[PDB]
Amino acid sequence: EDGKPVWAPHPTDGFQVGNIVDIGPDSLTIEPLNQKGKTFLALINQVFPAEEDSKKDVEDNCSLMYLNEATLLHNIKVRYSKDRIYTYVANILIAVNPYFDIPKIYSSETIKSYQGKSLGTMPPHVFAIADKAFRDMKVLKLSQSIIVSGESGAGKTENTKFVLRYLTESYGTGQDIDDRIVEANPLLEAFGNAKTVRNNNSSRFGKFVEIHFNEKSSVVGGFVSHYLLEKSRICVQGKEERNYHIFYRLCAGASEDIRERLHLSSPDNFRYLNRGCTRYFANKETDKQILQNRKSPEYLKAGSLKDPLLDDHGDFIRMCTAMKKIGLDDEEKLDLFRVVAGVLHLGNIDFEEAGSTSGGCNLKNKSTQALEYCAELLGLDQDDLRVSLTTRVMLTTAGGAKGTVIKVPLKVEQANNARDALAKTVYSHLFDHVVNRVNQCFPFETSSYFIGVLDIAGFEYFEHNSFEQFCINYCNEKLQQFFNERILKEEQELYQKEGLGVNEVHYVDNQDCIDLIEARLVGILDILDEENRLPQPSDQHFTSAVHQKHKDHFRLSIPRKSKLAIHRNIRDDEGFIIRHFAGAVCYETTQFVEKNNDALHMSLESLICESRDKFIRELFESSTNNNKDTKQKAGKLSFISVGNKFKTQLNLLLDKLRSTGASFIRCIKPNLKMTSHHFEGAQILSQLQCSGMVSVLDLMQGGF
Amino acid sequence: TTALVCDNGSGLVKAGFAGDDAPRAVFPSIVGRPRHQGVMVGMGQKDSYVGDEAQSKRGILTLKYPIEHGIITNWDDMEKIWHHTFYNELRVAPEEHPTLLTEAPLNPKANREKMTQIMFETFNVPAMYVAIQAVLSLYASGRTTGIVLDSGDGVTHNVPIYEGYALPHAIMRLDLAGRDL
Amino acid sequence: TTALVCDNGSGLVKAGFAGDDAPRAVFPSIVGRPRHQGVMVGMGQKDSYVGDEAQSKRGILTLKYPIEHGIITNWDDMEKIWHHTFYNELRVAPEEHPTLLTEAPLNPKANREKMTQIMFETFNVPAMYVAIQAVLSLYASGRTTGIVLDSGDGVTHNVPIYEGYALPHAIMRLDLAGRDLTDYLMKILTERGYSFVTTAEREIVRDIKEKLCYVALDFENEMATAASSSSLEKSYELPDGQVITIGNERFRCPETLFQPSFIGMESAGIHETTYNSIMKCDIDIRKDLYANNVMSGGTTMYPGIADRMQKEITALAPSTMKIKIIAPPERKYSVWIGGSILASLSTFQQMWITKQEYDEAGPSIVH
Ligand SMILES: Nc1ncnc2c1ncn2[C@@H]1O[C@H](COP(=O)(O)OP(=O)(O)O)[C@@H](O)[C@H]1O
Ligand SMILES: Nc1ncnc2c1ncn2[C@@H]1O[C@H](COP(=O)(O)OP(=O)(O)O)[C@@H](O)[C@H]1O
Ligand SMILES: [Mg+2]
Ligand SMILES: [Mg+2]
């Protein structure tokens, strides 16, 4: 526009009002409205059109005259001071966590005010999305999904329980499933929640709580499904990051009549915990309760971590209270502590060089008591387990004449990668036994249709990004593909319905970004599975092969060309910059190969399955119903895969989402401290640009 | 799809698809014709037995090893070895897979040519390559540097490789172990 | 902000920003291609490995020095040196700062032009300047008067400077030290039955030229007791386990630098080229040139200089005049420690050749 006030780039608030008093080809001489003497220069991507009266807000954001990404930011700045936390932006609901209890908006009188009424007949609320999902299920003959993204603590936990409260109170009229999520609230927190630099307590798996509806349309059951729990985090942690929270709550919160049974020591004595952060979270009363023998040198030197909602000393106590509430027995809870403590003494075993004759690798002299105190926890013989962690057993029998069983030793690096592959198998099959035990405390009556909630970790970005953030952000790019796929389909089901027109827009595709990461022996994940196979794996050869063959692609440049100055310190074969939906995020390639290269030997996979304990043999499947046992030996698949097993399980979730309808609820966190009324425009503007909301506004060209 | 590694040993020919476990079939490199008059009149016998069965029929045949001092004697016996290997061991059609064949380090010209030509025209494979047996023994212990001593019946070899280049001027071939033993 | 002193070594390229410590990167300039057919099939190999990475993989390459006889061989190899130097050591893009380059005294024209011109077009620096390597050791020693020595593999130079003006009419450049000392050591160690034909193995010759050699005080008289039964053997160990016991050649190799008639060439010894540059200066200045004889360059690191040089000069110099020779510690980094002081300080912040100035002026801006 010309003359009319436009938005101006303001440091703390994101955008401020301002006018244009001289102009260039792409640089604008911006005079601020409220700071007129500062008169700076600003670019085309820092100026946006603004509405005539600033004395208004919009309930229906499609009603804007100037609809852009700066006027969406101004609408949730005014509505936050009007006690309105819900905002209708087309088929996308923007919910802002206020960090206090607003008067009469979550009440039972509020629930029967919305009941059965459609969008555009009631103002913005999360109960108008939950009521839409029951009507766009039975009539439409389509199962539903509520998709929740955003940064941890942004309201993605809280809006989900208000949806499942609304589907039980408004339409189930009972059915005991609503507070069974609540009764095992710290129980599912400990196993999947970890600590990242950007998030103090974030769940690292795809929690998919589905709610079954039958042919009669009554709520007949629920089921809890889990997807994509981070494999690498189990064994390796970065600077100031942790493992899962049960590996700190069991270390801190275990009593002295339980610690003498489990043989626990402070985290500096456990190899899978001492490489990250060993500090526990606490509160003023529990910081006095953590014992002198439970403290690591990090805790002795720097004490407990700071955060008002986190206490790792007390939540192991409130976890075991929750096992009484959900449905776990007193004999079995003790066996659920021997397996967790067995993972901690699995990481301490170590393997040195060859002695002389017959090559191979042997254990270290200081790793003898580390295997004996672990083999009574995982139920294995102390003499037989040393052989399986050091040799590769195979046969001369395979297709011709009958032979015998031969022994080919493993290399030192093949034994270090094999010991960590066992810990990424045991804790992963333990977590399916905790979830499957919980799903049997409310077994469903029948099935036909379902309204589920997909909640996943958001787009994560730190100062230095690793392999853990490459696999999280690759999951958010595919979920961003499915976001834009349903929005283009919605406008196509709108223009001949209301008679608006035959107008059509050039779709926002991302296939070159997908083909860059995964393909048919062309992607980055395709090169990564090739590097695991090489005679001697390297870290210099993995980076250099990506810009050898994938050079032509636009969404890939060398780290030294980085727009952000900080990543220019990194050199050619140390990293790469990958452009995504939420921007260009650079990743280092240090330990990227090392986290991918775990592999599990056949008679080591067929040794932990052969366990000399009874709770342990139940863990590696399969159930009694239609019983059929796992074979003694195999050959194939050796390497198996890490980065392809993470891609394969994600493809099982993207095709389930394609059979369901969409209910996209984006959650915005207003401030860092998580306090009422506070506002940060250096964090709010960043979450509109990292949640895919910008890509939707840049697909909306309608003008209707 | 799945490639086939078929090893032209002088043992102990080895056959199995590409990875991941062990050779599917191993048997001695023997073809053997019947040296006695037939009198039971089944008739029931073959014009030539290959191994395994030419090692179950000891004392009634005249065993002929088709590979002798590092070279195949003639391709008339060799093709019958091949036919046995693909068909009654691996079972797969030859037109199905790309194959991978092995040779001896420093083997006489034009015995790789004549081989490649005859094998393409006899079995009609869709693609192929020939890698030398000593170099492959680097990969088994997964080292990128070192001197390889690969010793099988009837040719041993001493090949030096350094990260990851093979010196053409330092390769030694001995025609000694194991048939002379 | 800061300027970068990146020294175009004869050896031994040195790189480090201006102040406050010591050079950050040192490596011996070489490029090496893989000289035999590959069999591991990653493929995984660079078109050319530069130093230091080309010296951690000796024996499978064909080493090619880019700096030979005091001039660069071609900028096809040189640009790849430059790219390696900035990128996998210092970690900065050349467009960030004014740079400072060094050259050899009496450099062939237009090879300082063509260089200056190519470096501006290849790396796109915001400013450029070239200082001579001998002159910079003046700043390193902190002096105002005296004769300056940049002696590297293989062009040395002898420049006289007076308070603080340089003299165009007395500068002497010798093609001798140090690659002729390397090549000669290989020619007189072959003389005792150890052959080293290949380029990669020639590096081993440089490494014993560094470590084990020393300068005789009185050649004829050290040579006499070397001829005696007396043990001058120091036992070196080689990469394949070979044990070599060298005696005579150990003091013979650096001695080559005095009286080049060992080679048979006409060129005068450092003894006399030092002196003849002083006796090409005006008579009154000579008074303060004695006792400001300051040596530098890594090829002067041998033990026994400068007090051989001192005793020899004192014999040739006029009677009852004092000559003390100044030998710095850490002479290998002298030139760089020169450059570091200059480019960090005012006045010379406004004395660079800047981008517009260069664009307007063209290649004839160097002189
Ligand atoms: N345990 C053993 N001890 C000594 N020699 C053996 C043993 N097992 C097999 N051999 C010999 O090794 C030979 C097989 O070697 P092999 O590796 O098959 O060579 P190639 O692969 O070149 O045919 C046989 O001829 C046999 O005589
Ligand atoms: N301790 C030593 N004794 C004798 N010569 C040495 C010693 N250290 C280094 N050198 C020689 O000095 C050379 C390095 O000299 P340098 O000052 O780098 O010259 P430039 O700066 O002109 O490249 C090397 O080629 C090496 O042979
Ligand atoms: Mg062989
Ligand atoms: Mg020099």
From TrEMBL, chain A:
Keyword entries, A-Z: Actin-binding, ATP-binding, Calmodulin-binding, Cell membrane, Cell projection, Coated pit, Cytoplasm, Cytoplasmic vesicle, Endocytosis, Golgi apparatus, Hearing, Membrane, Metal-binding, Motor protein, Myosin, Nucleotide-binding, Nucleus, Phosphoprotein, Protein transport, Transport
Binding site for ATP: 150-157
Binding locations of Mg(2+) 3: 157, 203, 455
Record-listed Mg(2+) 1 binding positions: 157
Binding site for Mg(2+) 2: 157, 203
Domain of life of the source: Eukaryota
Ranges where the record places region Actin-binding: 650-672
Sequence positions that bind ADP: 97, 101, 106, 153-158, 199
GO-annotated cellular components: clathrin-coated pit; clathrin-coated vesicle; cytosol; filopodium; Golgi apparatus; microvillus; myosin complex; nucleus
Protein name (Swiss-Prot/TrEMBL): Unconventional myosin-VI
Start and end residues of each Myosin N-terminal SH3-like domain: 1-52
Family as reported in the entry's similarity comment: Belongs to the TRAFAC class myosin-kinesin ATPase superfamily. Myosin family.
Keyword Cell membrane on entry: yes
Gene Ontology MF annotations: actin filament binding; ATP binding; calmodulin binding; cytoskeletal motor activity; metal ion binding
Span of domain Myosin motor: 56-704
Example GO biological process: endocytosis
Organism name: Sus scrofa (Pig)
Subcellular location as annotated: Cell projection, Filopodium; Cell projection, Microvillus; Cell projection, Ruffle membrane; Cytoplasm, Cytosol
Bilayer topology annotation: Peripheral membrane protein
